[PDB]
Design a binder for these strands. Structure first.
Ligand SMILES: [Mg+2]
Ligand SMILES: [Mg+2]
Ligand SMILES: [Mg+2]
Ligand SMILES: [Mg+2]
Ligand SMILES: [Mg+2]
Ligand SMILES: [Mg+2]
Ligand SMILES: [Mg+2]
Ligand SMILES: [Mg+2]
Ligand SMILES: [Mg+2]
Ligand SMILES: [Mg+2]
Lengths: 46, 62, 362
RNA sequence: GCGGGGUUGAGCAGCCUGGUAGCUCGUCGGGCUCAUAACCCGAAGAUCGUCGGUUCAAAUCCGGCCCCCGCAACCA
RNA sequence: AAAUG
RNA sequence: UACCCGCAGAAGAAGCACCGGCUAACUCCGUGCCAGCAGCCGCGGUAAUACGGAGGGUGCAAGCGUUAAUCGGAAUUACUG
């Protein structure tokens, strides 16, 4: 178990909130397999 | 410097003498070096059966 | 007797659950060793140790004993259930029922103790919900969470109150603070503090991609705002002396300036604004008072900061639940309970998660 | 010590010789838009700091108390 | 006339 | 000592890396943007030949991989060019 090194510096008011506005809890959006962000130049096995 | 630690799980902590080898991790901003698993305080990976030499793991004798 | 039977069936399960959470065998072992130690006469020579040991033991004993009772009472009830059914003796049946009730109550008491051990666990709380980094989707998620919480509270019996709410410009809410009044409201909700992770196909995305948005809940108890007690004359040291420069014979002679000092803290306040010594003192006194308040606030801040830092050290572990609505599975990450009725959960069926969490002590 | 103030959530009016709660923003409900902003329509919202007094009647007049803002707090 | 995603 | 002769008995003697493309070698299970991998490009968000294990295979072999270092490929300082 290693410590996550957050980008908030010195947390003052609330830790969880701070974390939430951090890269660790950034939004993740998946790449489309079909649809908009869907075009693949080369396959996984291409 | 800052050094990556490959393999699943490690025993490292502060004041833990280790060997670094060079090799950058692409996704990490600023990491240019790997630790050597199985040199000095750094342990070999637990329960690895393939590429063991890369993770400092001895041949499981049977 | 069908309901009674059902209850009986439940109670054993409940007991088992309690045991699991407690780690009962370990506790028993501890009690044993401690008991042995107590029995040894050399322990009571060291007084501090002995009392501590005694304190440790008793609770353990209570925990074990109660558990034991639970095992037995149920069995007894079962035995008497047969009598109630086939032999058709009424009084006996009644007695059995009474026993069960008593036993149940006892069980509840132990479980209550386990759950609501903290100091502020009885008090009312402020649920604070804050949306994550996503944008609209995150806001929506936050809103949903808030709704769920509200549903839960109402179900429980608690009085909800939307203190503050920042709305999302498109949809959902950016942030919201909710006062949740009722007995053991904080103790019931404190576990929900943490980051909540939604996974679903975004309706606000034009691509319609799967999004993984986060949002924080943060439950804190309504602490009573303790009054700022005035300092004592004994704690202060008061110099009086001549002022800098000024103009005249009178000024040269008189000691209008006033330097008040705290003996505990080593803070000082001077004043020589006024001609009147008394006025200066009053001003100086006021200043001193202000300073003390500021010091108290600083102290409060510092302590809080430490706590915050500690919390941060958990990092990715602040993520307590995972609401996957694509594959339709809710999972609590710390306890490990799962449910496929996601919608139901959303609507406000958190008891299953919450109770477990409470039992765990996490 | 001498003045000025506290009025919908914000900033301002009225108090000017007691009895009429107005302006701009904001809030809420509709619309327009793929949606949001802007824009359009329609609503709501005030024990007038507090406590007493004078009155038929008080935001308004008088006093007390709490808070703010100026000023003045000197000749050695 | 017409800002943004 | 090299070297030669005799003795016994398969006897005392095989690992290391790799298998998405570049690049020779593919499947099942576990995990589910995590854990991890990675030279580049990238893989992993529940059917992963890319992670980890297994079976099968490929390449080297008393070595085999990794790191460092130099030239090469780089006609990418071009005298040849
Ligand atoms: Mg104003
Ligand atoms: Mg008038
Ligand atoms: Mg009136
Ligand atoms: Mg609009
Ligand atoms: Mg490869
Ligand atoms: Mg090939
Ligand atoms: Mg590999
Ligand atoms: Mg698979
Ligand atoms: Mg592999
Ligand atoms: Mg060259």
């Amino acid at each position: 178990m290693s410590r996550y090194q957050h980008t908030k510096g010195q947390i003052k008011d609330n830790a969880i909130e701070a974390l939430l506005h951090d890269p660790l809890f950034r939004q993740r959006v998946e790449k489309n397999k079909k649809g908009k962000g869907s075009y693949m130049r080369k396959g996984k096995h291409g | 410097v800052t050094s990556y630690i490959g393999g699943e799980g490690h025993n490292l902590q502060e004041h833990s003498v280790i060997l670094i080898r060079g090799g950058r991790v692409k996704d990490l901003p600023g990491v240019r070096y790997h630790t050597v698993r199985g040199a000095l305080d750094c342990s070999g990976v637990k329960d690895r059966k393939q590429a063991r030499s890369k993770y400092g793991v001895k041949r499981p004798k049977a | 007797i069908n309901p009674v039977n059902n209850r009986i069936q439940d109670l054993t399960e409940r007991s088992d659950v309690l045991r699991g959470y407690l780690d009962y065998d370990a506790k028993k072992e501890r009690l044993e060793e401690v008991n042995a130690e107590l029995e040894q006469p050399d322990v009571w020579n060291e007084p501090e140790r002995a009392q501590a040991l005694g304190k440790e033991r008793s609770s353990l004993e209570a925990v074990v004993d109660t558990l034991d009772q639970m095992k037995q009472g149920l069995e007894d009830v079962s035995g008497l259930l047969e009598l109630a059914v086939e032999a058709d003796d009424e009084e006996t049946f009644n007695e059995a029922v009474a026993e069960l009730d008593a036993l149940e109550e006892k069980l509840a008491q132990l479980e209550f103790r386990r759950m609501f051990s903290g100091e502020y666990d009885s008090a009312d709380c402020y649920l604070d919900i804050q949306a994550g980094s996503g944008g609209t989707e995150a806001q929506d998620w936050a809103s949903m969470l808030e709704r769920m919480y509200l549903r839960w509270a109402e179900s429980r019996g608690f009085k909800t109150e939307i203190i503050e709410e920042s709305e999302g410009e498109v949809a959902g809410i950016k942030s919201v603070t909710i006062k949740i009044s009722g007995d053991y409201a904080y103790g019931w909700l404190r576990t929900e503090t943490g980051v909540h992770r939604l996974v679903r196909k975004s309706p606000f995305d034009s691509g319609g991609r799967r999004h993984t948005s986060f949002s924080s809940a943060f439950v804190y108890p309504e602490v009573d705002d303790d009054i700022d007690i005035e300092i004592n004359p004994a704690d202060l040291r008061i110099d009086v002396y001549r002022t800098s420069g000024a103009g005249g014979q009178h000024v040269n002679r008189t000691e209008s300036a006033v330097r008040i000092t705290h003996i505990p803290t080593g803070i000082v306040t001077q004043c020589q604004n006024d001609r009147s010594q008394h006025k200066n003192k009053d001003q100086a006194m006021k200043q001193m008072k202000a300073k003390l308040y500021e010091l108290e606030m600083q102290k409060k801040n510092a302590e809080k900061q430490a706590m915050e830092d500690n919390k941060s050290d958990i990092g990715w572990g602040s993520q307590i639940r995972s609401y996957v609505l694509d594959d339709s599975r809710i999972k609590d990450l710390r306890t490990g309970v799962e449910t496929r009725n996601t919608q139901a959960v959303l609507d406000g069926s958190l008891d299953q998660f919450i109770e477990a969490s409470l039992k765990a002590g996490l």
